[PDB]
Amino acid sequence: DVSALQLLSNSFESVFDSPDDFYSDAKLVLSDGREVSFHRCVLSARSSFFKSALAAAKKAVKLELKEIAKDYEVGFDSVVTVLAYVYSSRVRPPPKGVSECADENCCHVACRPAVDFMLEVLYLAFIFKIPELITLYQRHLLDVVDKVVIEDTLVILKLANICGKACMKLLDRCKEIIVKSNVDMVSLEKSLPEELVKEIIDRRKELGLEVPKVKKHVSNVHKALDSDDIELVKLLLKEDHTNLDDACALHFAVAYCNVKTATDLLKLDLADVNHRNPRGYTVLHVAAMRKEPQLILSLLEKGASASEATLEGRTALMIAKQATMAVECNSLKGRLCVEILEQEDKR
Amino acid sequence: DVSALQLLSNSFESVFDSPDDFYSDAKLVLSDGREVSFHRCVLSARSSFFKSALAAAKKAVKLELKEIAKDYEVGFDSVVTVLAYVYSSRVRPPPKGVSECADENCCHVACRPAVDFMLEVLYLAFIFKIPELITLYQRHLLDVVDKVVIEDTLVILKLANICGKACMKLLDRCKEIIVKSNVDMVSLEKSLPEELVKEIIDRRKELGLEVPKVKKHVSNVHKALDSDDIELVKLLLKEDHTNLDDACALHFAVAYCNVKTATDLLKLDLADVNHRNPRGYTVLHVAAMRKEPQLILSLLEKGASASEATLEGRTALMIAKQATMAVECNSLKGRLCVEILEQEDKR
Amino acid sequence: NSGIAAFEMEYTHWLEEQNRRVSEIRTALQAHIGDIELKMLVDSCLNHYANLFRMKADAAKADVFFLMSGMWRTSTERFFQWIGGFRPSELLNVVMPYVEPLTDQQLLEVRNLQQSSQQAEEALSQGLDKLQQGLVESIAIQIKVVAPMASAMENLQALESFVNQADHLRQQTLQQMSKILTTRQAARGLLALGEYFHRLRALSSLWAA
Amino acid sequence: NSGIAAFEMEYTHWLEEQNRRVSEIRTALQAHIGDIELKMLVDSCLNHYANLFRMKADAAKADVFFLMSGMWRTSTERFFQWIGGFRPSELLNVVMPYVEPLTDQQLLEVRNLQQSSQQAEEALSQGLDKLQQGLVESIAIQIKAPMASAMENLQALESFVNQADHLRQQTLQQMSKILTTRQAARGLLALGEYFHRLRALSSLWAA
Amino acid sequence: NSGIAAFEMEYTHWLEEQNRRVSEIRTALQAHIGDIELKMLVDSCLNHYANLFRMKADAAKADVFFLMSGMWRTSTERFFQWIGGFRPSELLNVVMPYVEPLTDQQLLEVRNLQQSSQQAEEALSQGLDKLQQGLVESIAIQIKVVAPMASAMENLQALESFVNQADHLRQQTLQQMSKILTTRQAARGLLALGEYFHRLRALSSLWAA
Amino acid sequence: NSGIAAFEMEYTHWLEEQNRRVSEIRTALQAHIGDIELKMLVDSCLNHYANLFRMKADAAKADVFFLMSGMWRTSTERFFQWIGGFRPSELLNVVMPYVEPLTDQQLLEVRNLQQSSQQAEEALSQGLDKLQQGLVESIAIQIKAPMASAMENLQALESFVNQADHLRQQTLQQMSKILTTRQAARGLLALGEYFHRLRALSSLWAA
């Protein structure tokens, strides 16, 4: 009888909506500081993970999310959605702004905020061992992954590996997408664990694709830029074995290295700032992807052209808009960054 | 989706099936002393009565059902059924023996155990304020009452009046069934509250049905039997104005009076034992219905004939079988009465 | 006086015992116990009233006016006091519905008892009126003149005779009721009377709140 | 109820002061005084009765059943009780031979006082009897709205006691206004000796 | 002896300060702090090693044999003992992979340092061997016959001369490493060396469990 | 480590009792006493060496590394320490002039024992060199299985030190069986004076 079942669902959803009025006996604390109240029986029945955790904690109950789910920092709205599904078997939608970016032209289907929200909910469903939610959100990400940019597909693949064997479809799809694209070897090495890098290189070389080796001196420059050794890169360039254009040292410093290192690299002025890379991004594009205001300001004070587009036709303003969520324009890093970019573009 | 709701129902049914494993925080104790462990959140959500009672008890939580009910003694299987429906939203059939009588020819659709179980569940649904169970079991009793003996329809009408306005259809059907039959005025007065008897008599008068005036001497003897008198009735029978057979005093003493009074009135040997009253029941049939072994043994040792049948053709054996629950023939007064009458029939 | 203090303490204890015997008869009626064990309790209650009348006669041997004044009882019963106690015809009417049903013989006997109680009540009332007029007249001449002891003793003897005869009438009314009714009927009526007195005292407490 | 204990103590002290006032008038009457000396004793006796009436009203607010019971008076006195006190026409008959000789005007005034007081006494007695029977019946029905009836009937009893005491003092004062000084003193002397001998008699009897 | 007691307590304090310094090195390296503040910690570490060598020379004057025994070091370190310490060429080889990447100039400088260290090591080893045969031969004579003190005296000075030369070789090796490498590379190499020594101490504990 | 403190105390007392037995055998040889008492003194000294080897083996169980360092001996004797003790071939060279005169048969026996002792010493010294180099490399790799290797290598060192003490006992037994009582006594006296002179000379570098 579906009516009585829906009445049960409505009653428990009303319980979740006001847990103090229905004898809430436990609390789940997030990484930000906020907390969600929940009842021990419901989550001891719906999930095996919480049953084991609660039986171990009992040997007013607080559960630290940063300890049980440790491999991915999840937000508040994702935890709210997962717990709402646990109580009422109903997928509660996220509030406006969280799963939407700051680009009014973006449909907010594949932009970065929506991907991040979907990742957080899928990881929560994996940690809590809820197979139906896992399958539903894995299907969501498999439907959307074909439109998201490759740099975010890297993060999707990372989290798919975090979920182990429960997300085989998503992991294989992301691996195929990453293999088919022309991702730099340094990006793979600095974005994925050693196992994934080895697997991707083996699968790429097995398919007969172009897997060029890294120049030894260029690799030396990259590790020097990774160990905060500006004087090392200087002494190596004295040898004239490498050039900053062929090594893309600016792209590396802006993407992965520290802010002060990239600043010190810019203060030497021995590299074309508007130079591109095999993926087609300029230094200003990587500065927009990082959302670091000091890099964008120092690049604009050095002549960075903001009117250049990528291979897909996307400019720096679009990158800044699609990297920030709509909450910040409706840590003030994203907001400030996009504001500065907009100001420079209008000038 | 239906599958998710079914999974919710299954999880909470498993919760009810093992309350100590899922952190049970409340205990409903029955009238006998048995306890059922339940959780405060589920019943605070589904039942508003339980919410108000748990909110007042919270001012280690136990609820005495004999006190918040205090209007109808309820067994254990009916309480289990109501709590199982509260948790999992599905009705669970009682163990065989609770809703079945000792008559192997009875289909156990309208016999006394089934009616008693249905009434217990209906009263529980009324007290706990659950309208779906109220309507369901009101439907079951309405579908069944037409094939039940009138002496049980009296109890059904009593419960329908106790259960307030939530069972108007049941109350109206029971009143119609009672006023249609030829139930004596004394039985109505002693089996129903004052307002119900007044309403029934008003209906009987306005519907054209006859309501004979109570014979002043018959009423005097009935009050003497109600006051446990033994010496006042010898003067009323010595005044040549009343008559035990004319007043059915043996039937009255066996049906509604105490055991000692009926035994003494029978030992006076001043009335025909095999006399049939207006309804058509002998003293042996009334003794079998009352389920008191002393009356049956004293009747048989003095000459009570067991081969007579009532208006519907049912003999005393069928009544003694159909009055006891089946688990008792698989308080031991029912087993005692059935076995005493069976052993006496063997001699 | 020590006699009145003793009277007030004994009367308190009488009320306590009345409460005990009424509660015991409640328990006995509720357990539907047999007539034989019940009759001893009935006779105990009647004996207890007999002891009340005896002690009232003893108290009268000390201060007839105090007993007649009713000031040792609470306020609401005083509306029904007549020559040191209650008026039997009304208590009989009060308890009549609770002893019912009565047979023809019992109804005739009780109604005849009621008539005899009524005639005795009128005769005692008239005798009291004549006595009190005689006291007015004898006091008037005693104070007008500037024998007195003999007249005092005679008038106290007359008051003592009145109170004693009224207590006799009360005791005879009780015992005659005990013969016109069966044990069961008598128990029912005595229970009604006891509850009447208890509710009356409770109401007298409500009027003093 | 400390109110009744307080009443009994105040009434005892009233009796002592009454004894003092009777002694002062019986001593001044035998010394062949004039008018100044016999006007203050009467003004003080009258004030003392006024204080009696105030104290009786105070006791009446505290409790009515005890006051009506007359158990604060003596047996002899009791034989004369009527709605919380004595019957004025009989005490007037008692004192009449001692306030003689009266003039024709005084005689007519006294007889008119007697007729008016007799009619008021009869009407108050009948009203109290009717009230008492109506409360008897209402209590009988109540045992066999009740609180409202309780306080209304208690208020009615208090009101009747108040009107009877009022009439008592009105009769007092109109006598104090009709008569000259050399008439009231003889009546007060007779009254005082009457009460003292009556209390003596009662005491002697009670043994 | 007082000198050896002082040496062992002083060495305890040296070990505690080495631990603290390492704990500060790693912290600075992780916090990605700038070169200027890091250079103070680097030269402080070198000064601390210099103080170790100075105190070792002082202990060597008191009892050269104890210093050569390695008892003041843990058991596992004794497997690498040579005239009071570790083999510089092997510790440089140990730390080489962690200071990587080296420039071509740095690579030539380090391998030349390695060759000079190896030849100096061989020359000191041969000198020590010659000392040991001269001591066996000179001691053997003293018992056969019934100058001896003067020869023992020169022989005590020869042992101290060897340990002094080994400490000088160590200080030159440290100085050349501090001159070949940048501040960050030098810090990385010192970090590798410190973790190497700490892991050796942990293993030395582990063999005694 | 209480075991090493106990070892140092036992070895000190061993040295004093050794000094007493050397003095007793000195007096016995110089007085040219008969073979029986001298043989008892010989057996006492051999038992004392056996007790030294037993206590050294026990100390070796506690800490093989300390025993191998030879630090527990005095500084000058350390120059002659081969695998945890003295080299038998060198002590034989020391005593050669004092055990004279030897017969031709005794000379042949001494030279053959000397060749066998030299070969065993050389083979064990080579084995120790191999052990030390392999431990060096394995520790170097481990820092740059570890527990199992630690246990196996501790067992290997314990076995080597036991085998060296076995050689010491075997050479002592063979020489004590080859030599007559008087020659053995004179040789033991020479050996004891060698150690006494070594300790005395060592004392001057510390005083």
Ligand SMILES: CCCCCCCCCCCCCCCC(=O)O
């Ligand atoms: C068997 C008796 C049944 C009840 C009879 C009640 C009617 C009799 C009335 C007299 C009761 C006497 C009790 C009053 C005592 C008293 O006034 O002190």
Ligand SMILES: CCCCCCCCCCCCCCCC(=O)O
């Ligand atoms: C001016 C006074 C003339 C003589 C008056 C004599 C009678 C006066 C009556 C009024 C007072 C009655 C005394 C009774 C007091 C009481 O009942 O408590």
Ligand SMILES: CCCCCCCCCCCCCCCC(=O)O
């Ligand atoms: C910048 C230095 C990096 C690491 C260099 C390791 C090679 C130098 C070897 C000398 C280390 C001296 C520490 C030993 C101290 C001692 O023997 O007492």
Ligand SMILES: CCCCCCCCCCCCCCCC(=O)O
């Ligand atoms: C009875 C034999 C007499 C000849 C003795 C010759 C010397 C034998 C040397 C082997 C024993 C060494 C004694 C000390 C051993 C040690 O210091 O560990």
Ligand SMILES: [Zn+2]
């Ligand atoms: Zn978007």
Ligand SMILES: [Zn+2]
């Ligand atoms: Zn059946």
